[PDB]
Design a protein around this ligand. Structure first.
Ligand SMILES: Cc1nnc2n1-c1ccccc1C(c1ccccc1)=N[C@H]2NC(=O)OCc1ccccc1
Length: 127
């Protein structure tokens, strides 16, 4: 079994900025989710080899996780908030696509997503 390379967190010819919205996504959104009791399965890419999920990366073709998002935010990888918000939504969607309703991992994703939605509701206006 083999894992794919992780999503990129560095790319010098990708345009990027530091905006107040992106600062909020790190300081408030990422930090809130990262500290949650249910964050741990989402803190790094899915290790399909160790978890014995040989079909994971057949089904999930756009993987995303908070470890990647954290590095992207710390490395100022993004151009805008929308890009980062998309990464979070991809992470949650992947979980719901791969797993069954009521599964522990789905309940965990749902708890994190609720908080994500609460925080993103107060995304500040662009300065
Ligand atoms: C993130 C994410 N998205 N899906 C899955 N994780 C995940 C990522 C990383 C780690 C665990 C998980 C858990 C999980 C997490 C918490 C509780 C239940 C399940 N479940 C994984 N899914 C699955 O079928 O694992 C079977 C399995 C589960 C565990 C071991 C072997 C085989």
């Amino acid at each position: 079994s083999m894992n794919p390379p992780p999503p990129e967190t560095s790319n010098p010819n990708k345009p990027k900025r530091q905006t107040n919205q992106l600062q909020y996504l790190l300081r408030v959104v990422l930090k809130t989710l990262w500290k949650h009791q249910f964050a741990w399965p989402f803190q790094q890419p899915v290790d399909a080899v160790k978890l014995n999920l040989p079909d994971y990366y057949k089904i999930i073709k756009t993987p995303m996780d908070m470890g990647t998002i954290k590095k992207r935010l710390e490395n100022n990888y993004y151009w805008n908030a929308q890009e980062c918000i998309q990464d979070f939504n991809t992470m949650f969607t992947n979980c719901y696509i791969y797993n069954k309703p009521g599964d522990d991992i789905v309940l965990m994703a749902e708890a994190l997503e609720k908080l994500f939605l609460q925080k993103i509701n107060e995304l500040p206006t662009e300065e």
